[PDB]
Amino acid sequence: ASTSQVRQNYHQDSEAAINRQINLELYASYVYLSMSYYFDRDDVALKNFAKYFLHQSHEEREHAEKLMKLQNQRGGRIFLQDIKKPDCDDWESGLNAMECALHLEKNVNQSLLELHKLATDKNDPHLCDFIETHYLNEQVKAIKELGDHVTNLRKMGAPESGLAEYLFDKHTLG
Amino acid sequence: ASTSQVRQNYHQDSEAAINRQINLELYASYVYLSMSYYFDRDDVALKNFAKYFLHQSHEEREHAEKLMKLQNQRGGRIFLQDIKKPDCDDWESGLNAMECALHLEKNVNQSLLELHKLATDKNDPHLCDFIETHYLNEQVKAIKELGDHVTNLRKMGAPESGLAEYLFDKHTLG
Amino acid sequence: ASTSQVRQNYHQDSEAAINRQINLELYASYVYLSMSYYFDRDDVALKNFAKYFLHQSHEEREHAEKLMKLQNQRGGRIFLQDIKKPDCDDWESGLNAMECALHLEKNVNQSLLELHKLATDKNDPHLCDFIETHYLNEQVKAIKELGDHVTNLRKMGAPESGLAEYLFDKHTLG
Amino acid sequence: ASTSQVRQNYHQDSEAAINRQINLELYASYVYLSMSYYFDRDDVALKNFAKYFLHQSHEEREHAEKLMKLQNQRGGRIFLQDIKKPDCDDWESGLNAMECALHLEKNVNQSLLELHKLATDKNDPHLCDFIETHYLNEQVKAIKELGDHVTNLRKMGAPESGLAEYLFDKHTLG
Amino acid sequence: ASTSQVRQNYHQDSEAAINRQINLELYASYVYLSMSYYFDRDDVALKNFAKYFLHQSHEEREHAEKLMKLQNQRGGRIFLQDIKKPDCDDWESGLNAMECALHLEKNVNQSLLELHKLATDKNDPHLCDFIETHYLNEQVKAIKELGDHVTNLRKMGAPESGLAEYLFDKHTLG
Amino acid sequence: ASTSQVRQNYHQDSEAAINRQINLELYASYVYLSMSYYFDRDDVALKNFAKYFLHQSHEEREHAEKLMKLQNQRGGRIFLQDIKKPDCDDWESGLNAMECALHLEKNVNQSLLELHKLATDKNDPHLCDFIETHYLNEQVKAIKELGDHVTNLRKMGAPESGLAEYLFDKHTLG
Ligand SMILES: [Cl-]
Ligand SMILES: [Cl-]
Ligand SMILES: [Cl-]
Ligand SMILES: [Cl-]
Ligand SMILES: [Cl-]
Ligand SMILES: [Cl-]
Ligand SMILES: [Cl-]
Ligand SMILES: [Cl-]
Ligand SMILES: [Cl-]
Ligand SMILES: [Cl-]
Ligand SMILES: [Cl-]
Ligand SMILES: [Cl-]
Ligand SMILES: [Cl-]
Ligand SMILES: [Cl-]
Ligand SMILES: [Cl-]
Ligand SMILES: [Cl-]
Ligand SMILES: [Cl-]
Ligand SMILES: [Cl-]
Ligand SMILES: [Cl-]
Ligand SMILES: [Cl-]
Ligand SMILES: [Cl-]
Ligand SMILES: [Cl-]
Ligand SMILES: [Cl-]
Ligand SMILES: [Cl-]
Ligand SMILES: [Cl-]
Ligand SMILES: [Cl-]
Ligand SMILES: [Cl-]
Ligand SMILES: [Cl-]
Ligand SMILES: [Mg+2]
Ligand SMILES: [Mg+2]
Ligand SMILES: [Mg+2]
Ligand SMILES: [Mg+2]
Ligand SMILES: [Mg+2]
Ligand SMILES: [Mg+2]
Ligand SMILES: [Mg+2]
Ligand SMILES: [Mg+2]
Ligand SMILES: [Mg+2]
Ligand SMILES: [Mg+2]
Ligand SMILES: [Mg+2]
Ligand SMILES: [Mg+2]
Ligand SMILES: [Mg+2]
Ligand SMILES: [Mg+2]
Ligand SMILES: [Mg+2]
Ligand SMILES: [Mg+2]
Ligand SMILES: [Mg+2]
Ligand SMILES: [Mg+2]
Ligand SMILES: [Mg+2]
Ligand SMILES: [Mg+2]
Ligand SMILES: [Mg+2]
Ligand SMILES: [Mg+2]
Ligand SMILES: [Mg+2]
Ligand SMILES: [Mg+2]
Ligand SMILES: [Mg+2]
Ligand SMILES: [Mg+2]
């Protein structure tokens, strides 16, 4: 309807892209939530994996909130969609979950880069800076950490070695 | 598949009901999230309403987590479903959002009572106690608070009086 | 005359644009100064409006100083111009002054976006980053705050309700 | 229009003279601002001169604010005018800027004495006392300090001796 | 060989440019190291010049390390090259060394701007932001400081006046 | 050219040998730097190896600085040369890097012993004592530590056992 009194240099496409990204961040939150409680099962029982993915879940929820804040700051209107359940109910092993987290973070990062591209094409430097400042380096760090974790788990003998996942749990995530 | 080594006196129906309740708690989280950012809009701008519903959103997420913990404690398996978006994108007024929160909490409470009934019919006193201890009185308190809020807002002249919602924001939620 | 020993990748156009922006920031300072003392009049007497716009005036003066610092950092030369008096001597009401502050901040923001465009066209990433870092989000925040304030004042019954402006003074600005 | 409910023994001429003096104080603020950033240039680079004139600039702005406060206290109405840019963009040397500051403060003092004369002729002892209390001795002190500074700089060999200005910067202003 | 599991939107050209910049930062470290110990000679004996350039040397080494960190973060592979010795063994005077430091920092800055250009052409906003955030303003500050120092030394009578360099040593670098 | 006013009992050969040793210490610094960031790669990811070699790199740089200090103390003149890149870009494994560090420290030690021999042949007891005091026992300690590390890694099953390097990382270097 009529324009927001605050809206300036904020393209409708960018508004819609921010609504999509909000959904994605909430989806990531939900994936990490599912992973966490997988490690809390009595037949998995890797409680530092569980803590680690729980913390990641809460961070994703903050990423979503900051985008919702941003939408309103710029005078867009938030439109929420269903948060899809994760692909998996069973995440298999410590290694497998880390690998899927890595794929998830690379996908979120690709979405954030597309979003930056759009912002760039619509000459929205405030939005460019927002993405750069609060999102892009956060993704690079998260991706590098996950790569590091996957590498160690593999080198240690995961997923075959239940010993390896147990010791990684204690020494890296603990 | 084969039974959990921990599972004892935990009926499959109760397991499924706990998975439904987890979805509902996450749905409630999402409703309150949507309400919160509605009050953060530049054309609504009731920042204590926004804080209040944000805090409610985070509490719902903890309610969901405790049920996920419970599922595993008892040796059930968590099965997550889509978190539906809320009915509304636009919550109209402070009064209207409080009213919808009240309806939401009464629905969650009805689900929790049904769940207690099932637990009772399957002679699961641990599950009865869990629900009683962490959920039922929490719902009674939340419902009474919301009723109190709705009552004050109405008595003050909401929703017509923008003054009333502004002062309720400062004095009750502030 | 001969080039600054420090100057590198700093186009003359960008130098001139920074001198214009310095004038604008000082002009904004002066507007807020005028508004402030309007609320200090014995026939207006809204002392938190007065404090609020005084603080905004001092911030604008810091924005101007940082641009003057920047000019010298980059090896440009500051050229100062008259600081025009504000459009208004009489700002009418709390609501009207907030509305004019909103229009002022949107104009400053448009100038800052034009300046970013120029910096972008002249491939000055240091200048891009400067603007992004210290100016653009500051404008988005200031604009959103003002929108929020205008909205509340309107909803409360301003400008007709002298009660509304008095209570906004105490509860939001106080 | 109709008289201020607070106005008593405050002649219109005095009201107008206070509006002129407010402009002058803001003009002085602006001169000192310009001088300050001159010393911040990479080809001047006397950072304590810069600090010293910056502090003087901020003080002038407070002098202007106190006169604006006074106007309202007495029930006059503030009428703001353009703040003219300074005579100079380039202040030449430490010595030259101090000399121009001295001339500026003697001019402000002459205006303040004229203003006192008017106040005296209109039998406004409150206004007499205001000027005496917050302005006249402040000017005498500022003038004597500047004279002292000019004298030292000259005795040291300024402006020819770049060494002299550098050491004055460190030892007197530092 | 096969791609890094972490690599995303990171062009080979950018990877190579980061390896070049790492060499340059180490080269800058080495220049400042050489300058420092020049001032530690018994026939030069300006111990605050020596401290100042030593600190600059250590900072350059940190700049190099952060680029090496960045390379790995992004999934590039570090390729190190010889660190060339400095042009000079004998830096002549305080003034001459400052002048050469200024030329060095302007060259590093030109390399960093070229690198930003490449990053921009390959649509790598994370890399753009990295450069902006940790490098470009650091260069602008370092260049302005050096300009300031060169200016003072010249104004004081350097390099002919051994007195001037000695007093600059004590008062500016001390 | 003409002799240093401070120079006494300091043979030109010793002066040249100290310049060579300075190059070697910087070369060692550079080797350890390269090793460190190898362990920071996402496909190696042994962050305590990385810390350990980084710390060794910084120590080598201090060893180089103390020799540069010494050169000037004695009235020699520092002549810097290119710092060659390390032999390796890829250090293979934790065990392999430790082994190469051991070979590096034994080479530095052989150079330091040659240098002591020269100092002895030129009857420079101050230089003898310098080497003894700040270098020789430091090398013996560093060599013994590295031997200890290599031994443990081998006994643990390195380099085949990625588990072994991971646990050594946590327990010995951590
Ligand atoms: Cl727009
Ligand atoms: Cl649009
Ligand atoms: Cl949907
Ligand atoms: Cl980082
Ligand atoms: Cl059972
Ligand atoms: Cl059953
Ligand atoms: Cl579903
Ligand atoms: Cl109770
Ligand atoms: Cl009230
Ligand atoms: Cl109150
Ligand atoms: Cl230029
Ligand atoms: Cl140009
Ligand atoms: Cl003008
Ligand atoms: Cl923000
Ligand atoms: Cl009167
Ligand atoms: Cl009169
Ligand atoms: Cl005017
Ligand atoms: Cl006095
Ligand atoms: Cl890539
Ligand atoms: Cl490529
Ligand atoms: Cl090479
Ligand atoms: Cl800065
Ligand atoms: Cl002195
Ligand atoms: Cl000798
Ligand atoms: Cl000899
Ligand atoms: Cl060489
Ligand atoms: Cl020992
Ligand atoms: Cl342990
Ligand atoms: Mg994270
Ligand atoms: Mg995220
Ligand atoms: Mg589905
Ligand atoms: Mg950019
Ligand atoms: Mg950042
Ligand atoms: Mg609640
Ligand atoms: Mg609940
Ligand atoms: Mg639907
Ligand atoms: Mg209870
Ligand atoms: Mg502001
Ligand atoms: Mg501003
Ligand atoms: Mg005019
Ligand atoms: Mg920022
Ligand atoms: Mg003063
Ligand atoms: Mg004054
Ligand atoms: Mg004019
Ligand atoms: Mg008297
Ligand atoms: Mg007095
Ligand atoms: Mg530096
Ligand atoms: Mg550098
Ligand atoms: Mg060569
Ligand atoms: Mg920055
Ligand atoms: Mg060592
Ligand atoms: Mg060594
Ligand atoms: Mg070679
Ligand atoms: Mg010893």
Name the residue ranges covered by the structural domains of chain A.
1-174
Q: Residue B15 burial (CB < 10 Å; 0-12/13-18/19+)?
A: middle
Whether C20 and C12 have beta carbons less than 8 Å apart is answered as: no
Q: Taking CB atoms and an 8 Å limit, are E42 and F4 in contact across chains?
A: yes
First to last CA, chain D: 52
Helix (H, G, I), strand (E, B) or coil at C85: coil
Whether A71 and A2 have beta carbons less than 8 Å apart is answered as: no
Task: Choose the mutation target among A2, A3, A4, A8 for the interface with C, i.e. most C CBs under 10 Å.
Answer: A8
CB atoms within 10 A of CB F137: 10
In whole angstroms, give the CA distance from residue E97 to residue E41: 14
CA–centroid distance, residue B81 to ligand 3 (Å): 13
Whether F69 and E40 have beta carbons less than 8 Å apart is answered as: yes
Cβ density class B97-130: b for 16+ within 10 Å, e for less: bbbbbbebbeebbebbeebbebbeebebeebbeb
Helix (H, G, I), strand (E, B) or coil at C83: strand
Put simply, whether E120 touches C (Cβ < 8 Å) is yes
In whole angstroms, give the CA distance from residue D167 to residue F36: 48
Q: Which long-range contacts (CB under 8 A, 24 or more apart) does B124-127 make?
A: B124/B9, B124/B10, B124/B11, B124/B14, B126/B9, B126/B74, B127/B10, B127/B14, B127/B74
Beta bridge partners of D83: C83
First to last CA, chain F: 52
In whole angstroms, give the CA distance from residue C136 to residue C113: 8
Pick from E30, E29, E49: nearest CA to E99: E49
C105 is in an annotated binding site: yes
Tokens linked to B165: 């919602």
CA–centroid distance, residue C108 to ligand 14 (Å): 18
CA–CA min distance C70, chain E (Å): 9
**Do chain A and chain B touch with ≥3 beta carbon pairs under 8 Å?**
yes
**Amino acid letter for position D136:** L
Tokens linked to A6: 């605050």
E126 is in an annotated binding site: no
In whole angstroms, give the CA distance from residue E164 to residue E159: 8
- F contact chains, 3+ CB pairs < 8 A: A, E
Put simply, whether B78 touches A (Cβ < 8 Å) is yes
Whether C113 and A125 have beta carbons less than 8 Å apart is answered as: yes
Whether E31 and F69 have beta carbons less than 8 Å apart is answered as: no
CA–centroid distance, residue D133 to ligand 45 (Å): 11
Helix (H, G, I), strand (E, B) or coil at E136: helix
Q: Indicate if the alpha-carbon torsion angle D163, D165, D168, D170 is positive or negative.
A: negative
Tokens linked to A24: 């994605």
Pick from E90, E54, E86: nearest CA to E173: E54
Q: What Å resolution does this PDB entry report?
A: 2.0
Which 3-state string (H, E, C) describes F19-58?
A: HHHHHHHHHHHHHHHHHHHHHCCCCCCCHHHHHHHHHHHH
Task: Choose the mutation target among F40, F163, F165, F171 for the interface with A, i.e. most A CBs under 10 Å.
Answer: F163
Longest dimension (CA), chain F: 62
Question: In angstroms, how far is CA B46 from the centroid of its own chain?
Answer: 21
Whether D97 and D91 have beta carbons less than 8 Å apart is answered as: yes
The residue behind tokens 């952060």 is: E66
Q: What are the two backbone dihedrals, phi and then psi, of residue B83, each rounded to the nearest 5 degrees?
A: -95, 110
Nearby residues for ligand 5 (ion, Cβ within 5 Å): B 7, 10
Q: Which residue of A has its CA nearest to C106?
A: A8
Q: Report chain B residues whose CB lies below 8 A from the CB of C151.
A: 42-45
Torsion of Cα atoms, D4 then D6 then D11 then D15, to 10°: -70
E81 is in an annotated binding site: no
CA–CA min distance C129, chain E (Å): 6
Whether F111 and F156 have beta carbons less than 8 Å apart is answered as: no
Put simply, whether A154 touches F (Cβ < 8 Å) is yes
Contacts of C172 (CB under 8 A, 6+ apart): C149, C152
Query: D123: left (phi > 0), else alpha (psi -120 to 50), else beta?
Result: left
Whether C139 and C105 have beta carbons less than 8 Å apart is answered as: yes
Q: Report chain A residues whose CB lies below 8 A from the CB of C117.
A: 123
Pick from C13, C148, C165, C45: nearest CA to C94: C165
**Amino acid letter for position C54:** L
Q: Indicate if the alpha-carbon torsion angle C150, C152, C155, C160 is positive or negative.
A: negative
Tokens linked to A107: 């996908």
The residue behind tokens 């959904």 is: A23
DSSP state of B58: H
Angle in degrees, CA E7, E13, E17, rounded to 5: 100
Residue numbers in the known binding site of F for Fe cation are: 25, 60, 63, 105, 139
Q: Taking CB atoms and an 8 Å limit, are D47 and E152 in contact across chains?
A: no
In whole angstroms, give the CA distance from residue B103 to residue B5: 40
Cβ density class F121-132: b for 16+ within 10 Å, e for less: ebebeebbebbe
Helix (H, G, I), strand (E, B) or coil at D83: strand
CA–centroid distance, residue B37 to ligand 1 (Å): 20
Query: F-contacting residues of A 134-153, CB under 8 Å?
Result: 144, 147-149, 151-152
In whole angstroms, give the CA distance from residue F52 to residue A164: 24
Tokens linked to F23: 């190059």
Experimentally, the structure was elucidated by X-ray
Beta bridge partners of E83: F83
Tokens linked to A151: 């590498």
Whether omega before F86 lies within 30 degrees of 0, making that bond cis, reads: no
Kindly state the helix (H) or strand (E) to which residue E146 belongs, with its residue range.
helix E137-156
Tokens linked to C47: 């002392």
CA–centroid distance, residue B84 to ligand 36 (Å): 6
Query: A144: left (phi > 0), else alpha (psi -120 to 50), else beta?
Result: alpha
In whole angstroms, give the CA distance from residue C7 to residue D53: 25
Whether B82 and A82 have beta carbons less than 8 Å apart is answered as: yes
Pick from A64, A2, A1: nearest CA to A28: A64
Angle in degrees, CA F171, F172, F173, rounded to 5: 105
In whole angstroms, give the CA distance from residue E16 to residue E71: 10
Tokens linked to C138: 């500051």
Count helices and strands in chain C by DSSP H and E runs: 6, 0
Query: C-contacting residues of A 12-71, CB under 8 Å?
Result: none
The angle that helices D137-156 and D94-121 make with each other, rounded to 10 degrees, is 160
Q: What are the two backbone dihedrals, phi and then psi, of residue E159, each rounded to the nearest 5 degrees?
A: -90, -10
Whether F42 and E75 have beta carbons less than 8 Å apart is answered as: yes
Topology of domain B1-174, CATH? Ferritin (1.20.1260)
Longest dimension (CA), chain C: 62
Nearby residues for ligand 52 (ion, Cβ within 5 Å): F 25, 60, 63
Tokens linked to E154: 């010249």
Q: Report chain A residues whose CB lies below 8 A from the CB of F45.
A: 147-149, 151-152
**Do chain B and chain E touch with ≥3 beta carbon pairs under 8 Å?**
no
Angle in degrees, CA D92, D93, D99, rounded to 5: 95
DSSP state of F83: B
Tokens linked to F5: 């006013």
* Number of residues written out for chain E: 174
C-alpha dist (Å) from residue B69 to B22, B62, B63, D169: 10, 10, 10, 69
**Do chain A and chain E touch with ≥3 beta carbon pairs under 8 Å?**
yes
Q: Report chain E residues whose CB lies below 8 A from the CB of F41.
A: 72, 77
Q: What are the two backbone dihedrals, phi and then psi, of residue F124, each rounded to the nearest 5 degrees?
A: -105, 85
Beta bridge partners of C83: D83
